[PDB]
Design a protein around this nucleic acid. Structure first.
Ligand SMILES: [K+]
Ligand SMILES: [K+]
Ligand SMILES: [K+]
Ligand SMILES: [Mg+2]
Ligand SMILES: [Mg+2]
Ligand SMILES: [Mg+2]
Ligand SMILES: [Mg+2]
Ligand SMILES: [Mg+2]
Ligand SMILES: [Mg+2]
Ligand SMILES: [Mg+2]
Ligand SMILES: [Mg+2]
Ligand SMILES: [Mg+2]
Ligand SMILES: [Mg+2]
Ligand SMILES: [Mg+2]
Ligand SMILES: [Mg+2]
Ligand SMILES: [Mg+2]
Ligand SMILES: [Mg+2]
Ligand SMILES: [Mg+2]
Ligand SMILES: [Mg+2]
Ligand SMILES: [Mg+2]
Ligand SMILES: [Mg+2]
Ligand SMILES: [Mg+2]
Ligand SMILES: [Mg+2]
Ligand SMILES: [Mg+2]
Ligand SMILES: [Mg+2]
Ligand SMILES: [Mg+2]
Ligand SMILES: [Mg+2]
Ligand SMILES: [Mg+2]
Ligand SMILES: [Mg+2]
Ligand SMILES: [Mg+2]
Ligand SMILES: [Mg+2]
Ligand SMILES: [Mg+2]
Ligand SMILES: [Mg+2]
Ligand SMILES: [Zn+2]
Lengths: 137, 58, 79, 90, 48
RNA sequence: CUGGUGACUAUAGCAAGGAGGUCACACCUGUUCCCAUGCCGAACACAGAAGUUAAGCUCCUUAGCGUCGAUGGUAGUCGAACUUAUGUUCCGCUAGAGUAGAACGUUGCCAGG
RNA sequence: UUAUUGGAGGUAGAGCACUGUUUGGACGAUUCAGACAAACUCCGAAUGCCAAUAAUUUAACUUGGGAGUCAGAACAUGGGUGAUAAGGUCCGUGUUCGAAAGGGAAACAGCCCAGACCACCAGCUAAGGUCCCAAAAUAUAUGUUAAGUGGAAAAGGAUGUGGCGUUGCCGUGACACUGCGCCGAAAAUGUACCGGGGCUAAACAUAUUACCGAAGCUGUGGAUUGUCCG
RNA sequence: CUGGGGCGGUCGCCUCCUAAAAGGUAACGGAGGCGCUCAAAGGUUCCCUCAGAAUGGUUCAUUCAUAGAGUGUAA
RNA sequence: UUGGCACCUCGAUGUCGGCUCAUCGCAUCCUGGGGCUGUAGUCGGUCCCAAGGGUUGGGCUGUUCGCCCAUUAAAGCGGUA
């Protein structure tokens, strides 16, 4: 599971999820990519499951770039407690994903093989995705 | 040269700044009207409350 | 149950601009409250012990550029 | 290698730009600076013919300026060219 | 460490100046020239 | 043209190449006098003039780094209508980034030529 | 209040020049590319605010007499907290209720329209509506849907069907986008979220011409209180 | 005080964020500090410029280095 | 269900289990119909339709629950303060 080695503040306000993707909207390292078309938090466990699906389908022969990182911690209260008495403890780490953002990139395989690997990864994610290639012209 | 302004929509439910502009225009009750000299300040007041008033040229 | 170790803040100090550019001020009028020289004293304007900028004469306040990355405030007699 | 551009007259509101892009045109600027608009399909064909850094004979109004593509704004969602800049080669 | 200090000069009973000092750093009776309103002049005021 | 001293957001800077020095500005010579070194005539200070453009400095050329920077479009957003959709529409304002490009300072006063 | 002009300030956005976080290269930590931030900023709006002198407008301030109030609520929006739970909770902003009747939303303080001095068996409109209940279009033109979708929901699945297209073969494949529908869809007294009847338009999307519709406005008479000129 | 009360925690002051680019702005929201110190660490005049790195030397020297140091103490 | 919230009720809305009497839902326990099966047969597994009727007598415990004894076609899960 990806997570920062350290952060300055462990308790953070949850990020704003309205709007469109600030950047990373293009394939820059690989040949094909998976582009989000809806918005969600993406957790490190979801990232790991999607990455495992992709790498298993391409037999660790091509190469994958994970374009998102879960920089943001989020807290959760302990079970069966009333409101108040301070913020809860860190539960996990999320990345903010908005329409346009490229989630994964792959290179070194055919278009059909990449499409299938990315479909398998997409079914592990809480967002709708589209197969994309590097933009030319 | 002259503009007739009619207060066509109510000020009930409108923000206080819009109400203040309505009053500064000289409008009093719904469907009341004023005749004013056309100039940029009057145009700006009208623009602020254009959704509440109807403007015609005399 | 638990408890929080936070919950402290000092009183707000009401800093910032106290008179407008182009406004007439009597001598001694405080023009700017600040920590450090966020704005510098210009013509006929003094800097207090707590960095307060105040007018040394009666006149009109002018906030102006001071170099590339600094600014200042002056007071010019109306005449 | 050729493409006709229609000059945009005056200011175009946000609604005007939206209607243009719906009807299938791409707003562009030629650089005197000229605001123009082209057809996305014909532009794609010319770019395919001449390459990215090729040379185009843009028919701006009555004249014909030899230009290239200095920059272009694209929309990865909807897969649409949204703006073009044509630098006159001189 | 730090204690309150009262300075009074010879030809006055005004005792109008109070100040502070570190007893460890300055074990002596500190002396200083201070203006004395009674005499309208500076005088040698010394810690009591 | 040089020099002093000001004003102006580095368009003024930095860097890389050339030309210059009679007066001037300098590097320079000395430590006897004013003065000076946690040590040193290095610097500061005073006396000067053998020497040299080598450097600082001035003029010419480079857009290389920095700096400035549109138009057009986009993000955002005041207001309005729809709406509950990680929203839509209209209107006004309008970035940041990036592009064309600008820029190897301009200029007041005084003195010298 | 608006117009113009000047100013203070660092939010939205953006960006990586600082701090911190992070992914691939290359090279002998540097460089290259690409990302993240309430307590990051090389940057930086819209607004809002403070002022100055024109248009419109009618307050504003001072001093005294007399209070009541210190349980607030919903809605919309900027945020914290909670779980991008609550008809939750705490702040900012606006409206309404409170203290507001009338029309609409079946009924429904807080939503939409709109502020009732009194009388009328006059008229025009607002939101919302015009087949019957129940006032007004079984209105007009073009198209979409066949699911009673309309008249409560997702990942995901699918030769449903309309409109744009890009291409391969020489009728027909593959592909992408978009409109409207389908499945996914199980609760407890009784049909049982269209309010009922009913509707294939009486649904939906554009465009148009009418009308209905309030205690809004207008018309007529009257009451009281104010100004200005009875 | 308290998302019933108790138990736990808190109670005054300072700095930051939340705070929506004037000011102000709440929660048992997110982070820290204070209840001093200094006889110079005050005043004034004069002079001076840092951290780091590389390169050589059994701290000393050179060059890059707008501060990436320091500013008694938290921001 | 355990909770979160504190909106009705503190000038009173009787709390658990059992008894009596039921009534409704279907995510069906039995019985009826059917597809697939790693369904030879007899038996089973799983899914679909189906709420008409049926769906126990004891030992222990206040118990709900649960375990056990002996049955049964079956000894279903929930709602109704
Ligand atoms: K950075
Ligand atoms: K509370
Ligand atoms: K604040
Ligand atoms: Mg980028
Ligand atoms: Mg001081
Ligand atoms: Mg002081
Ligand atoms: Mg932001
Ligand atoms: Mg509430
Ligand atoms: Mg809420
Ligand atoms: Mg509020
Ligand atoms: Mg009350
Ligand atoms: Mg009402
Ligand atoms: Mg009111
Ligand atoms: Mg309702
Ligand atoms: Mg009613
Ligand atoms: Mg009422
Ligand atoms: Mg009518
Ligand atoms: Mg009728
Ligand atoms: Mg339905
Ligand atoms: Mg019904
Ligand atoms: Mg109805
Ligand atoms: Mg009336
Ligand atoms: Mg408690
Ligand atoms: Mg503000
Ligand atoms: Mg503020
Ligand atoms: Mg403490
Ligand atoms: Mg203490
Ligand atoms: Mg409950
Ligand atoms: Mg409450
Ligand atoms: Mg009670
Ligand atoms: Mg009673
Ligand atoms: Mg069934
Ligand atoms: Mg017995
Ligand atoms: Zn004395």
């Amino acid at each position: 599971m990806l997570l920062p080695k350290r952060v300055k503040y462990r308790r953070q306000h949850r990020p704003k999820t309205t709007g469109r993707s600030k950047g990373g909207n293009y394939v820059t390292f690989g040949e094909f990519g998976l582009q989000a078309t809806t918005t969600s938090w993406i957790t490190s466990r979801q990232i790991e499951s999607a990455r495992i699906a992709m790498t298993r389908y391409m037999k660790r022969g091509g190469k994958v770039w994970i374009k998102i990182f879960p920089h943001t911690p989020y807290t959760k209260k302990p079970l069966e407690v009333r409101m108040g008495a301070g913020k809860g403890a860190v539960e996990g780490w999320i990345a903010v994903v908005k329409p346009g953002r490229i989630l994964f990139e792959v290179a070194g395989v055919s278009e059909e093989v990449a499409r299938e690997a990315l479909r398998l990864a997409s079914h592990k994610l809480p967002v709708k995705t589209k197969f994309v290639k590097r933009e030319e012209l | 040269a002259k503009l007739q302004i009619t207060l066509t929509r109510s000020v009930i439910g409108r923000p206080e700044t819009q109400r203040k502009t309505v009053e500064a225009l000289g409008l009093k009750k719904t469907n009341s009207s004023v005749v004013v000299e056309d100039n940029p300040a009057i145009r700006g007041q009208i623009n602020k409350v254009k959704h509440l008033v109807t403007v015609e040229e005399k | 149950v638990s408890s929080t170790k936070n919950g402290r803040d000092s009183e707000s100090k009401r800093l910032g601009a106290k008179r407008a550019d182009g406004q007439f001020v009597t001598g001694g009028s405080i023009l700017y409250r600040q920590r450090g020289t966020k704005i510098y004293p210009g013509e006929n304007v003094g800097r207090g012990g707590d960095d307060t900028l105040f007018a040394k004469i009666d006149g009109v306040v002018k906030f102006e550029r001071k170099g590339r990355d600094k600014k200042q405030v002056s007071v010019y007699a109306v005449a | 290698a050729s493409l006709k551009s229609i000059i945009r007259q005056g200011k175009q509101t946000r609604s005007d730009l939206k209607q243009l892009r719906k009807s299938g045109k791409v707003p562009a600027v030629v650089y005197k600076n000229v605001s123009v608009k082209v057809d996305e399909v014909e532009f794609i064909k010319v770019i395919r013919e001449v390459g990215r850094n090729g040379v185009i004979e843009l028919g701006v109004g009555s004249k014909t300026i030899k230009v290239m593509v200095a920059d272009y704004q694209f929309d990865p969602l909807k897969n649409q060219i949204t703006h073009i800049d044509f630098l006159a080669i001189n | 460490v730090r204690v309150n200090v009262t300075l009074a000069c010879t030809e006055c009973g005004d005792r109008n100046y109070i100040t502070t000092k570190n007893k460890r750093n300055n074990p002596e009776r500190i002396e200083m020239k201070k203006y004395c309103p009674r005499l309208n002049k500076y005088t040698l005021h010394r810690e009591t």
